[PDB]
Assembly symmetry: D3
Homo-oligomer: 220 residues x 6
C-alpha cells in the first residue's frame, strides 16, 4: 500500500501513496521507493519509469514527525517526474533527481530547509540552481516561498504544464515516444548524459555534504 | 554550388545549399563548410560570419545515404546562425556551435540520434543541456520530438524569432552592430568567452567521444 | 551623500546616489559602496542587504570622465538583493550580476558596452553574464552593446521578478522580510554553501577573465 | 587514557594511546581524537598540532573486533604534523594522509588492507593516496596490501623526512618551533588558502569515493 | 605469432611479439592487443593482466613504415606492465596506461614525438606529467632523451626495478598478491580509482586531441 | 646592466644581474625581465630561453626595501631555469614558472611569505605543491626553511643537479637537444602542455589571488 507500482506498455509508474500524510517519506517509504527504482533498472520488462504522488500533494518531504544519506541509485532508464501537487524540501529534491519533469497546474515547489533550520543532503543546493537558475534558487531557498507551475515552466524546472486531469496522460505520451526509439541508444545516451552531469556536480555535492555535517556539528 | 559564400561590408554569409537533400551534410559539404569557417578566421576582409541554409530546411544532419570527428575550428570572429527551418541532429549540432542564434518562425529543432541508433560526436550531449536546460535536452534527445521556434526562444536556445522573410535582415542587423564596435575588443572578449566555455565543456566532450567509441565498439 | 545607507528591522538598504550623474561609480563611490558591503557582513543589526539606485538609472557603469580595476565585491554570508530601478550598464551590470537575487522595475534594462568602448571586463561579466542569461544572449549583449529589456531579462532568468516601478522597493522588502523570518544560522550556512559551490565553478573562469584583461591592456601598451 | 593530550609552548601533541591494541581506532578513540582536533582549532593556546602514536604502531586502523564510517577530520586552519612512529594501516593510513606534513621514524611503514578485508575506503584514501605517493604505487599498495617502508615513502614523497626512531618527536617539534616563530596570521591565512586550493581538486574525487562505497555496501546487501 | 597470450591461475600475460621490428605496433598488432585487453575484461578466468614485450625492446611505438585514435578500453581488472626494455613514444603511452609498472634494469623511456614532428593522441601530454612530474615530462618531450630505469624509479613512473631475468617473476608476484585478495573489492576499488582519475584527466585528453587536430590541420 | 642578455646557437640566456643586491627584483628589473621574455617569444632568432642569476644568489625575491600582479607572459618557447644559488619567495616563484629546472649544488629554495607576513600572488601556493608535493610545500611555506639542491632533486622540483662550475653548460646541453628537434612540434606540444596545466591551475590561482586580497584587506 504505501507505494503503488504498475506497468503498462513497458512504462512503470511508481506512485507515492500516503496521501493523508501528504506523501511524506518515512523510513519505510524511502526503502520501498529507492528499492523500486533499483528494481526497475534490472527488470527487462521496463524501459521508462514515471514517478508521481497520490493527490493532492506530490511529496511533502521527509517524515519529520519520525525524525540522512542520499540513495537515488544509478539508472540508465529514464525517469519522468509527473508532479501532481506540492513538491517541498526533500520532495523537491526527488523532483530534481528526475531526468524530465511534467507538471499539473496544481504543481508547486518550495525549499523549507532554512525555514525548519536544516541543510540539504539530497542535492538541492546543487541541482536547484542548475535547473531553475542561481537567483531563483536563492530566492526559493532563503524565503521558503512557493514557486508556481507557470513560473517553474518559465525558469526551466519543468518541460510542460497541463491541466490536472491530463497529467499522467502527458507523462505516458512522452514515455511512449521514448519506448518507440532504439533502447540501446536511449540508455547509452542517457548514461552518457549522467556521466557528463555527474562530472560537473560531484565537487558541489561533496561540498553540500560537508556543509551539512559542519552545520549539524555546531548545532550539536 | 553546394555552399554559397558572399562577403558584404565585412560580413560573410555561408549558405548550405543542397535544398533538394534538405542541406544534408555530405563529405563534400562538410569539407567546404568547415574549410570556409577556417578561411574566414584568417581573411582580413571579415569581421563577422553568418551561417544559414537554403529553404525550406536549415540542416537535416549528416548525409545518411552516403554513410564523424569534430571539425568546427577555433574562431575569434563571431558566428551568427540564421535558422531558416528544421535543424536536426548533426544540424542541431551546427546550430549549437554558433555564438548567437536567430530563428525564423519556421525554425524547429530535433535530436534524432537515439531514434536512428547513434550517439553524438559534435557536442550535442554537452551543448544542448547547456543551451536549453537539462530537462528539455533530455526530453528532446529521448523522444526525438521537435522543439518549436517559440519554445526555443523561451528556453534560451535562440535570442530572437522573426517572421520568415525578415530572417537574414535580422542577422545582418546584429552583424552590423558588432562590426560597428571596436574589433580588437570584440575578438579578445570572444576569444575569452570561448576559453572560459572550453574550460567547462572539455571534460564533457571527452566523455561524449568515449561514450560514442564504446557504443560503436559493442555494435 | 553619494551613497545612502538605511537600516530598518534587520534589512539595510544601500542606494547609489548620484542621480544626476546616473549613479556612475567614481573612486569615491566605489570605496563607499564596497566599504558598506564589508561593514554589513560584520554588523550584528543586519540580516539582509538590498542594493538599488537613485532614479532614473540603477548604475551607468564606472565614471569614465574621471578615468586597473581589480574586483572588490567582498565575501558575504548575508543575502544581497538587487532592486534594479533602471539601466544597469557595464560595471553597473556587473554589480547586478554579483547580487544573490534580482528584482526589476519595468524600467530596468541591461547592457554591456565593454566592446563598444574597447575594454575587457574584470568584475566577472564574462563568467556570470552567460551564467545568468544564457550563452547566446550574453554573447549578443556583449558584442552588440544593445539593451536587454526587463521583460527579456525575466524570460532569460537574469531577474526573478518584474514589477511596476512604484512597487520596486516594496517587492525587495517583501523577499527581505521572508528571509528575515527564517532561521538565520541556517540562512547563512546555506548561502555560504551556495557561494562555495558557485565559486568552485566560476574560479577558473574569473582567473581567465583577469588574464585576458591583462593581455589586452599589454598589447594596447604597444599601440 | 586512550588519547593523550599535552601542550608545550603553543604546540599540542595528541598521542593515540592503546599501544597493546596497536592504537586501533575504537568508537571511543575516534570520538576522542576527532573531538581533540576540533578543540585545538578553537584553543587560543595552540598554534600547531602534532599527532603520533604510542609505540610500536602509529595506528593499526579501525577496531574491527568492535565492528557506515563517515569522514570526521574537521576543518582546521592550524597545521597538523604527523609523527609516524610505526605502522599506519588502512584507517591509520588515512589519518596520516590527512596531515599537512609527515615525518617518519625508520620504523614507520604504510599499508592499505581495504581490498584484503573486502571493504572500500571512506576517509579519502582513494583520492589522497595517489595524490601523495603517485598513482602506480597507490594502486600497487591498495591492490596487494603490501607494506611501504619508510625509505620508499620518502622516495615517493609521502613523508618529508625519515629520522632514527629516538629522534622522531624531536624532529616534529623542530618543524613546530619554526612554524610557531613565524607570523601566525600569515601562517593561518596561507594554510587556509592551501586547504581551499587542494579541496577544490579533491572534492569531486571524495564524492565519487563515497558513492563507490555506498554502491559496494548495497550490492553486498544482496549477498 | 605477433601477440602471445597465456593464462595461468587467473593471470593473463599478453606479450607483444615482433622482436625483429622492436615490437612496433602495426595496424594488425594494435587490433590484437587492444582486442585482447577487451576480451580480458569479460573472461571469467581472468583476475589480473600482465603486458610485456619480447626482448630486447618493450615497444618502439607505432609502426612508422606502414604509416591514431585512442583504443585502450575501460577495464576493472588490473594491468601490470613489465617493461623489459625501451618504451618509446606510442610505447611509452602503453606503459602510461598500465595501473602498475615494474621495470627491468634494461627499461628506458622516451618521447620522440617532437623529434619526428608529431603530437601525441594516446594521453602522453596528460599522463607523463602526472607520473614523472611536469619538469621531467617537459625535459623528456622536448629533448627526446631516454630516462633510465633507475631515474624512472626515483620519479615514480615505475614501482620497482629488478635485474632483467627477474622481471616476469616480479610481475607475477604482484599479480598473485592481487589475486589472493577479495576480487569484488579489488574491482570496485580499481573502478573507483579509474573514475576519480578520469574526472581529472578528461579535460586534458580533450585538449590533447584538439591540439593534435590543429597541428595535423596546419600541415 | 641590471639584466644581461646573450644569444648563442639560438639559445638566449637572460641573467638577473644585481648580484650585490642578491638579484632582488626591483620595479626596473621586473619590467626588463618580463619584457625580455615577451621579446624572446616574438624573436625568430631564438628557440629556447635560459634564465639564471649572477652569483652567489639566483633571486632573493622582490625588492622589499623598495616596497604585486603576475606578469609572466604567454610563451610557446621553452624556458629552462639554471638555478645558481638561493631562490627565495618571489624568486622561488620565478623558478616555479620555468618549464624545466637544472640546479647547481649551490641551489637552495625557500618560501618566506609567512615569515615576513605576506601572501603569494605569483602562483607559489599552486605550483609549489604541484612540483615538490603537498607536504613538502607545506613544510617549506610554514617553516620558511631552506630546501637543498639534493632534496629538490628528490622531490622533483629540479630535473638535474651538477657541480657549480658545470651549471650553464648543462642547461645549454638540454637546450641544444631541444633546438635539434622539430620546432613546429616543440612549440605546438609545449603550448598544449601549458593549456592542459593552465586548465588545472586557473581555479587555484584565482583563489590565491582572492586569499591575498582578503589578507591585505584585514591587515589594512
Amino acid at each position: 500500500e504505501i507505494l503503488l507500482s504498475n506497468t503498462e506498455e513497458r512504462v512503470r509508474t511508481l506512485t507515492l501513496n500516503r496521501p493523508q500524510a501528504r506523501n511524506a517519506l518515512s523510513a519505510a517509504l524511502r526503502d520501498r521507493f529507492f528499492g523500486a527504482l533499483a528494481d526497475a533498472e534490472t527488470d527487462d520488462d521496463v524501459d521508462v519509469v514515471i514517478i508521481t504522488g497520490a493527490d493532492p500533494v506530490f511529496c511533502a518531504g521527509l517524515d519529520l514527525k519520525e525524525l540522512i544519506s542520499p540513495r537515488w541509485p544509478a539508472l540508465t532508464k529514464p525517469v519522468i517526474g509527473a508532479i501532481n501537487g506540492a513538491a517541498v524540501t526533500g520532495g523537491l529534491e526527488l523532483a530534481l533527481y528526475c531526468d524530465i519533469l511534467i507538471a499539473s497546474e496544481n504543481a508547486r515547489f518550495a525549499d523549507t530547509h532554512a525555514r525548519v533550520g536544516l541543510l540539504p543532503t539530497w542535492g538541492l543546493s546543487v541541482r536547484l540552481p542548475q535547473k531553475v537558475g542561481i537567483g531563483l534558487a536563492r530566492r526559493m531557498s532563503l524565503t521558503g516561498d512557493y514557486l508556481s507551475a507557470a513560473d517553474a515552466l518559465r525558469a526551466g524546472l519543468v518541460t510542460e504544464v497541463v491541466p490536472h486531469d491530463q497529467l499522467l496522460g502527458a507523462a505516458q505520451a512522452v514515455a511512449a515516444s521514448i519506448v518507440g526509439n532504439n533502447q540501446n541508444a536511449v540508455r547509452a545516451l542517457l548514461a552518457s548524459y549522467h556521466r557528463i552531469d555527474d562530472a560537473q556536480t560531484s565537487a558541489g555535492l561533496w561540498q553540500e555534504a560537508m556543509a551539512a555535517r559542519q552545520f549539524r556539528t555546531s548545532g550539536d
